[PDB]
Design a protein around this ligand. Structure first.
Ligand SMILES: CC(C)(COP(=O)(O)OP(=O)(O)OC[C@H]1O[C@@H](n2cnc3c(N)ncnc32)[C@H](O)[C@@H]1OP(=O)(O)O)[C@@H](O)C(=O)NCCC(=O)NCCS
Ligand SMILES: CC(C)(COP(=O)(O)OP(=O)(O)OC[C@H]1O[C@@H](n2cnc3c(N)ncnc32)[C@H](O)[C@@H]1OP(=O)(O)O)[C@@H](O)C(=O)NCCC(=O)NCCS
Lengths: 307, 311
């Protein structure tokens, strides 16, 4: 049977960097690393530079997801921002991928704005999730306010005046009451979150989805077993940092012994994030324009490009 | 809110206005020859409905093609040429066969000459024998009465450029697939796939929806639409014409229907619609409607008075 994806291993993908030079120092790179997430200069050069290239070809060739329709009715004024999305399991390290992609796309061919918006800011406040009995489902599609997320991207893309975005706080495990921040129309918009690939055709009737505004979608992938230990390990680091803040919504986790923490982390993964993984995330994997698969060392050892 | 309903709605004048300057490459005589039984196709229908569609469809194809090129540059390799796949779905008697026929004529000479193969999904039905053994032929046309492992393998082979691909052929005279009727299919530039089950997918009944459907190979899908009441009378009327033509053949699987009085025929046609095709309609077809890239809604005169494009 024919498959829609082209597969490359590290050497093959890396070989596609051609001559894009790199615009980042090791120091700058290290600052982009996420908790329990390693990012080397070789990872940037071998994985992200070839991606920068491709991504750049697509942008300069005004080949967007809404290009055909525009020409079919009316191309107007354009100047339309390029929209890239980044999806994948919690703890997969999609936040680091977004950060470096944004740094590179910012100075690669020429200076571009490049805004990085995270989808979590668009979650329904803990209050609402409470009223809908949805917070054993934080991160699930229904725990997000997408009428707003879609309205946001539409406004940004379409050049609407004063657009603002809600902001999420991991310290209080909820969106900041009056934290909305203005977002200036950028040249490129990177959208990172769990629900960025949702479509009315994985599950639903119509409704409209944020994925319908995306031009290129990246899915950061890793086997279930690796994601489990990554989640647990990352949890243990939170115990040493974020959780030590007395105002932390999970401050009590700072007090758990190391073995209780591991226990608590597993049930949190198994009973919530894993469900989300299997139910709403994995299914979207084969819909991405690009898939990056990481190994035990957090490095991408395989790339799949949808032809 | 219009910002978020997935479909863009146009009426005849609005859609028609989108034809721009695509010229037409068909004479009235050529068009008339494309009409199906009990199906009217005018030159205005072609110009107002199918030309704008030819345009859009064409934009998609070259875009889709331009893409293969950037990637080609990026990879540093060449030799693409993946056929463009269009599908056509809709109720039995909705006139989806006519739509396929004209779309294929137009796409064949519009921007430039393209091959354009038109395959009908019925050829892939399980022979009457198999349907018999599974007690499935009060369900001819239902998803399960089709051999899709084969339909999918076919499209995959065609798209992927496999050597000698062949397709099974269906015969309405014998109400079954032709025992040794398989015909070779040369890889085309465009493949139009028309049949009842072309939009089926995992969403349709989620129980090991971990299967592959032909709809996963389609690039653009068109759904020919018409209200239930219109489809019923269109089915009955069409049946009455079969009575005057196809059924008059002594070898027709339904020859006995030629002998029915006009009132018995109407009665026979209704129960055939109500007990079989209507079920299929409600159960497996209607549900797929809102998944199509485009929806063409026809009125009592068989003309498309409304078009819905999925943004
Ligand atoms: C809010 C939430 C949905 C975010 O999910 P996400 O979009 O998949 O993104 P990620 O899981 O990749 O995490 C993204 C960033 O937030 C951080 N993060 C995630 N959860 C965190 C937490 N509870 N406390 C502090 N930081 C957290 C990561 O460190 C990462 O940033 P980095 O780049 O600085 O490392 C997830 O934290 C949440 O609530 N999940 C539901 C159950 C659960 O695990 N709850 C928290 C239990 S302590
Ligand atoms: C085989 C069958 C599944 C085809 O269904 P389909 O894919 O929906 O396509 P359509 O109903 O739109 O018909 C397609 C073409 O076949 C013709 N056709 C359909 N049924 C026919 C029949 N019984 N005899 C002769 N021609 C028939 C139409 O005239 C049309 O071609 P046209 O463009 O020349 O008009 C349908 O004929 C069948 O068997 N349905 C089950 C119950 C039923 O009605 N059976 C036949 C009762 S007489």
């Amino acid at each position: 049977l024919m498959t829609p994806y082209l597969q490359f291993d590290r050497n093959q993908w890396a070989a596609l960097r051609d001559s894009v030079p790199m615009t980042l120092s090791e120091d700058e790179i290290a600052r982009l690393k996420g908790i329990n997430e390693d990012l080397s200069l070789e990872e940037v050069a071998e994985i992200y530079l070839p991606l920068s290239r491709l991504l750049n070809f697509y942008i300069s060739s005004n080949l967007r997801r809404q290009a055909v329709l525009e020409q079919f009715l009316g191309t107007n004024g354009q100047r339309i921002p390029y929209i890239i999305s980044i999806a994948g399991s919690v703890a997969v390290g999609k936040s680091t991928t977004a950060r470096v992609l944004q740094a590179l796309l910012s100075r690669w061919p020429e200076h571009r704005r490049v805004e990085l918006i995270t989808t979590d800011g668009f979650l329904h406040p803990n209050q609402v999730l409470k009223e809908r009995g949805l917070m054993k489902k934080k991160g699930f599609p229904e725990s997000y306010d997408m009428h707003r997320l879609v309205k946001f991207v539409s406004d940004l893309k379409s050049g609407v005046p004063n657009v603002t975005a809600p902001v999420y706080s991991h310290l209080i495990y909820d969106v900041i009451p009056d934290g909305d921040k203005t977002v200036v129309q950028p040249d490129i918009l990177i959208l990172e979150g769990l629900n960025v690939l949702q479509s009315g055709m994985d599950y639903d009737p119509h409704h409209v989805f944020v994925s319908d505004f995306v031009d290129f979608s990246i899915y950061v992938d890793a086997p279930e077993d690796l994601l489990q230990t990554w989640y647990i390990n990352r949890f243990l680091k939170f115990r040493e940092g974020a959780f030590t803040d007395p105002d932390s919504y999970f401050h009590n986790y700072a007090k758990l012994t190391k073995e209780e923490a591991i226990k608590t982390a597993m049930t949190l993964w198994k009973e919530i994030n894993w469900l989300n993984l299997k139910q709403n995330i994995l299914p979207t994997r084969e819909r991405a324009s690009l898939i990056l698969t990481k190994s035990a060392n957090h490095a991408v050892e395989e790339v799949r490009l949808r032809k």
